[PDB]
């Protein structure tokens, strides 16, 4: 009787452990997304500085203009 | 009854390891959400950049030849 | 004996909880993946924004020495 | 003797469902991964824009004092 059960239990332990692994494997896949982002984040900071640098030039012109 | 209880414990230690790997995986995800916020928010900055940079040319293209 | 049934039950509920936990996560992901179109769409705005600047540099370079 | 097999059969089904939950999460990731490639490529375009724009204002500011003074 017990044989099939000792066996079915050793199935699950192995399978669960397979999944544990699948999941650890999935986290690295994530950390690596998070860190490929950085270059993106950077470029955003560049667009922002660039918006400011323009807008500042308009302001500088609006005053120059009236002459 | 030994093997069942032995393996049934192998398994409980395996199932609670998974709880831990799942939690660990959310936190990477959660952290990944954060790190996109800057980027989603980006669409809006680009548009402002376009507007400002448009505006900056206007004020110069006209105002240039004018003086 | 009984400790074996009760320990199996405990397990089964704990795993269903993890299925839920995981399915949950996929939903969360898809939510993000949908967030990106709006940005990806801008890369075409950045491109005609570049072209337009480059052409101005071009114009002003020619016109400079003039 | 029974209840044990019954519940075992439940726990086999539930763990099998997870192989499938996990596989099904791998796919939504592999697709998130894909849709960023487009955005990393915007980065290339942004630096050249940052070049290109910065040069405009180089050719503004030089020609400003140079065709307004002369």
Curated annotation (Swiss-Prot), chain C:
Compartment annotation: Virion; Host cytoplasm
Region (Homooligomerization) residue spans: 12-63
Disulfide bonds: none
Modification after translation, per record: Phosphorylated by host IKBKE. Phosphorylation contributes to efficient viral replication and transcription.
Coiled-coil spans in chain: 13-41
Source organism superkingdom: Viruses
Record family assignment: Belongs to the filoviridae polymerase cofactor VP35 family.
Oligomer status and interactors: Homodimer. Homooligomer; via the coiled coil domain. Interacts with nucleoprotein NP and polymerase L; VP35 bridges L and NP and allows the formation of the polymerase complex. Also interacts with VP30; this interaction is regulated by VP30 phosphorylation. Interacts with host IKBKE and TBK1; the interactions lead to inhibition of cellular antiviral response by blocking necessary interactions of IKBKE and TBK1 with their substrate IRF3.
Role played: Plays an essential role in viral RNA synthesis and also a role in suppressing innate immune signaling. Acts as a polymerase cofactor in the RNA polymerase transcription and replication complexes. Serves as nucleoprotein/NP monomer chaperone prior to the formation of the large oligomeric RNA-bound complexes. Regulates RNA synthesis by modulating NP-RNA interactions and interacting with DYNLL1. VP35-NP interaction controls the switch between RNA-bound NP and free NP and thus the switch between genome replication and genome packaging into the nucleocapsid.
Record remark: domains: The interferon inhibitory domain (IID) binds dsRNA.
Name the record gives this protein: Polymerase cofactor VP35
Source species: Reston ebolavirus (strain Reston-89) (REBOV)
Curated annotation (Swiss-Prot), chain D:
Region spans: Homooligomerization: 12-63
PTM annotation, UniProt: Phosphorylated by host IKBKE. Phosphorylation contributes to efficient viral replication and transcription. Ubiquitinated by host TRIM6 to facilitate virus replication.
First and last residue of the signal peptide: none
Chain coiled-coil ranges: 13-41
Domain of life (superkingdom): Viruses
Location in the cell: Virion; Host cytoplasm
Assembly and interaction partners: Homodimer. Homooligomer; via the coiled coil domain. Interacts with nucleoprotein NP and polymerase L; VP35 bridges L and NP and allows the formation of the polymerase complex. Also interacts with VP30; this interaction is regulated by VP30 phosphorylation. Interacts with host IKBKE and TBK1; the interactions lead to inhibition of cellular antiviral response by blocking necessary interactions of IKBKE and TBK1 with their substrate IRF3.
Family classification: Belongs to the filoviridae polymerase cofactor VP35 family.
Purpose: Plays an essential role in viral RNA synthesis and also a role in suppressing innate immune signaling. Acts as a polymerase cofactor in the RNA polymerase transcription and replication complexes. Serves as nucleoprotein/NP monomer chaperone prior to the formation of the large oligomeric RNA-bound complexes. Regulates RNA synthesis by modulating NP-RNA interactions and interacting with DYNLL1. VP35-NP interaction controls the switch between RNA-bound NP and free NP and thus the switch between genome replication and genome packaging into the nucleocapsid.
Description of its domains: The interferon inhibitory domain (IID) binds dsRNA.
Protein name: Polymerase cofactor VP35
Primary gene name: VP35
Span of the entire protein shown here: 72 to 134 of 329
